Each structure stands twice: as C-alpha cells, then as structure tokens.
Amino acid sequence: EALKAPVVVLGAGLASVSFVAELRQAGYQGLITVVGDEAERPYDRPPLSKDFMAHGDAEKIRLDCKRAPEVEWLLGVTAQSFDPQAHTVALSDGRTLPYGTLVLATGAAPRALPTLQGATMPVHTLRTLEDARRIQAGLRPQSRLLIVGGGVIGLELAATARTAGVHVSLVETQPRLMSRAAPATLADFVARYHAAQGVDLRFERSVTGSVDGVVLLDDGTRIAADMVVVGIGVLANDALARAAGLACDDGIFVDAYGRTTCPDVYALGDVTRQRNPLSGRFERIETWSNAQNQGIAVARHLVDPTAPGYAELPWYWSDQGALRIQVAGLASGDEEIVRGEVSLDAPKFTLIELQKGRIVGATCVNNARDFAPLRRLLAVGAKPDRAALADPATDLRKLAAAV
Numbered sequence: 372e373a374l375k376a377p378v379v380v381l382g383a384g385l386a387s388v389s390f391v392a393e394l395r396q397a398g399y400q401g402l403i404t405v406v407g408d409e410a411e412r413p414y415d416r417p418p419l420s421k422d423f424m425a426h427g428d429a430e431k432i433r434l435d436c437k438r439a440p441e442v443e444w445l446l447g448v449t450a451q452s453f454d455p456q457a458h459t460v461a462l463s464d465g466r467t468l469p470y471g472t473l474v475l476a477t478g479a480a481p482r483a484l485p486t487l488q489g490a491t492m493p494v495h496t497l498r499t500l501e502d503a504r505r506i507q508a509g510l511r512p513q514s515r516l517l518i519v520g521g522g523v524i525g526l527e528l529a530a531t532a533r534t535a536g537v538h539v540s541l542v543e544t545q546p547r548l549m550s551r552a553a554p555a556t557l558a559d560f561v562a563r564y565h566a567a568q569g570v571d572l573r574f575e576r577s578v579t580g581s582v583d584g585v586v587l588l589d590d591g592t593r594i595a596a597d598m599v600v601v602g603i604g605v606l607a608n609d610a611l612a613r614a615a616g617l618a619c620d621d622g623i624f625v626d627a628y629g630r631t632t633c634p635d636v637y638a639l640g641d642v643t644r645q646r647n648p649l650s651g652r653f654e655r656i657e658t659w660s661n662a663q664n665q666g667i668a669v670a671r672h673l674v675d676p677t678a679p680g681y682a683e684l685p686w687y688w689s690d691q692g693a694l695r696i697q698v699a700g701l702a703s704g705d706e707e708i709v710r711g712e713v714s715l716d717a718p719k720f721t722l723i724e725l726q727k728g729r730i731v732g733a734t735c736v737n738n739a740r741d742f743a744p745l746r747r748l749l750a751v752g753a754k755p756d757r758a759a760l761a762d763p764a765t766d767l768r769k770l771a772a773a774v
C-alpha cells in the first residue's frame with residue numbers, strides 16, 4: 372500500500388545502502404535508483420578519523436552493496452529539488468526521476484566556524500573521503516594542528532595525529548570534552564588520557580578570528596597552527612525537504628516508520644530528527660548504528676506493514692588511541708555505578724547509568740565483552756541489584772540471560 376514503485380533514494384551513504392539492501396532482502400523486486408552527490412563507491416565514514424587517516428587505503432572502507440542487487444547508483448549527481456505533487460526529482464545532470472516512494476538519506480554536513488570565514492590559513496572539516504585525504508596531505512610529523520571542538524571525531528583525529536608525530540592543540544567552548552553524548556566521568560577520564568599523550572587542551576575557550584597563520588581566542592590569546600580542523604558538529608542536509616514543504620528543524624521530522632509530513636516521502640539516518648525512546652524527546656541521532664538500523668527498520672516496514680516501527684536504543688563507539696570507547700543510552704540518570712578502576716594504567720572500566728533503579732545508559736572502555744549484555748539490559752529497562760552491578764564478581768552476560 373505505502374510501498375509504491377519505483378523507489379528513489381537521495382544520498383548514497385550508510386543509511387541509503389542499508390535501506391536498499393533491506394528492501395531487496397525483504398523481497399521488493401521493483402526499481403530502485405540511488406542518487407549520490409559524491410563521485411565515490413559508497414564508503415563508511417568511521418575509518419576516516421581512524422585507520423584510513425593512519426594508512427590511506429580507500430579500498431578497505433567501501434560499503435558492501437552485495438545485499439543490494441539490481442540497484443542503479445547515480446554517483447557524482449546532486450538532487451536539486453523534488454516535486455511531491457508530480458512525484459519527480461530534478462538532478463544536476465539535467466535528468467528527472469519519477470518516484471512512487473522517495474527516501475531522503477542525505478545525512479549532515481560539518482558546521483562552519485563563522486569567525487574563521489576568510490581565514491588565510493588551511494581550515495578543513497572532516498566528513499568525506501576527500502576531506503580525509505586533504506587533512507592527511509598536511510599531517511606532516513612536527514606539524515602543528517589545532518582542532519576546534521572536543522567531540523569524538525576531533526578526539527579521534529587528535530589521537531591519530533599524535534600517533535603520526537603531529538603536535539595537537541584542541542579548543543573546546545564547554546568545560547568538558549564530548550559534551551553531546553557522554554557521561555561526565557568518561558569525559559573527565561578522556562581529557563586526562565589526551566593530556567597524558569601530549570594534546571594541549573583548552574577548555575571554556577572560543578575562536579574569535581585568525582591572522583597570518585595564528586588563531587585568536589576569546590581569552591585574548593593566540594595559537595599558531597599549520598592547519599585548523601573544525602569539529603563543532605554537523606547540520607542536517609535538509610534543504611530539499613525544506614524547499615518542498617516538509618516539516619524540518621535542522622533535520623527532517625520522522626516518525627518510527629520513517630514518514631515525513633509529505634505523503635510518499637520518507638527520511639532516514641543523520642538527516643532525521645526522531646524520537647529517542649529513552650528520553651521520550653525528538654533528537655538528531657548522529658550515529659553509525661542509527662543510520663544502519665533506522666534504514667533497515669524503515670525498509671522492512673515498507674515491504675511488510677505488519678513489521679514494527681524503528682525501536683532500537685541509541686549507541687556509538689569511538690577509537691581514541693589506546694581507548695576503545697563504547698557508549699549506549701543516556702549520559703546520566705540519578706545514579707552512576709563504576710565497575711573497575713578509572714586509571715591511565717591499562718584503562719579498563721564500565722559505567723552504568725540508572726534512573727530509579729532502571730538501567731538507562733552504559734559505557735565500556737576497553738571492555739567490549741560487557742557492552743553487549745549491558746545493551747540487552749538497557750533494551751528491556753532492567754532493574755538489577757545495584758550491589759551486584761558494582762561487585763566485579765558479577766558476570767553481566769549472566770544477568771542479561773536471567774532477564
């Protein structure tokens with residue numbers, strides 16, 4: 372009923388690939404056409420601040436489009452507009468695509484820093500393979516890099532650059548790192564780790580401008596750098612949706628079926644503003660797991676309307692040198708339980724966030740084994756014995772089973 376052929380998807384990132392693979396796997400055999408503005412074989416972004424930044428082989432980061440047979444991928448083509456009455460999409464190459472169902476999977480773009488508009492020194496953001504190549508081409512040993520923003524991507528780049536023998540300074544407007552999506556205990560530990568690896572961290576500082584290779588701060592001081600990478604967050608790529616009259620606010624509003632306010636138009640991944648089931652509030656979720664899992668859920672329900680809506684709880688990971696960080700659910704509740712010691716000597720620990728005895732979030736540092744059972748406990752809103760949660764004798768995989 373809702374799934375009308377032909378299917379057109381705008382964007383060829385993870386959300387798009389995951390969606391079209393699930394359409395095919397679920398048994399939809401109609402036309403699928405995907406429009407991607409990047410002239411690149413679809414690829415995954417997490418490597419760009421990690422192993423790619425370090426080793427430079429793009430053929431290790433391509434998405435597997437095997438589970439998406441009989442898809443026409445229009446790469447290097449921009450969707451300029453769509454007409455939701457005519458059920459058409461206008462492309463940059465002069466062609467028009469008809470659709471029965473239109474899927475907006477256009478992701479998000481790094482926010483520019485207004486105070487570095489008209490900088491006369493290298494200022495980059497890190498989103499694309501082209502961005503990663505341009506940054507890597509300036510990552511010379513004993514270079515000076517300034518990162519603006521203490522989000523996970525800036526910190527992943529900081530670790531990669533330090534490992535490469537690059538001097539790194541980092542300016543954060545907040546009093547802590549990872550203010551978006553991380554428990555304070557984690558953010559404090561992570562700052563201690565980066566400081567110990569030689570990152571020059573500047574907290575509660577904002578950039579006010581730049582002059583001849585030097586960045587100016589709002590404490591009236593200067594940081595000289597060979598290169599600036601700005602990581603102050605992203606803005607949804609929701610321009611086509613806004614122009615066509617869909618409900619958007621830095622992100623296209625969708626329900627759990629991926630429906631926008633425009634009939635026959637859906638949206639998925641980083642472009643969307645959606646319900647976080649743990650907070651009960653709408654948020655733009657900026658994670659790999661959301662892009663994949665939302666794309667799959669929306670495709671499954673299009674093919675099989677008896678399937679449930681998207682229901683997965685949020686989580687991400689970050690690889691920052693010696694720290695393999697995993698974070699699920701909410702950053703805080705009324706209670707944090709710490710398993711293990713929080714120590715720079717062989718870091719290994721777990722945080723559990725509870726709200727009235729109920730697990731609402733969890734963090735693992737170098738403890739992948741405990742993250743899977745904690746996500747299962749989170750998913751059913753488990754209320755375990757807080758003494759047991761704290762006790763390192765406790766086996767979390769066992770608790771997961773018991774419930």
Ligand SMILES: Cc1cc2nc3c(=O)[nH]c(=O)nc-3n(C[C@H](O)[C@H](O)[C@H](O)COP(=O)(O)OP(=O)(O)OC[C@H]3O[C@@H](n4cnc5c(N)ncnc54)[C@H](O)[C@@H]3O)c2cc1C
Nearest residue numbers: 382384385386408416417450477478640641657658659662
């Ligand atoms: C450097 C980096 C590291 C990351 N590391 C992690 C990590 O460790 N863990 C984690 O959970 N998440 C991580 N993420 C986040 C994760 O990669 C994103 O959540 C994910 O890429 C979102 O996928 P998407 O398909 O919704 O959007 P995107 O990947 O942005 O894909 C959308 C595509 O649509 C294109 N597009 C936009 N407008 C148009 C148009 N008009 N016409 C055609 N094409 C268009 C875009 O240019 C883009 O190619 C990282 C992201 C980056 C950039």
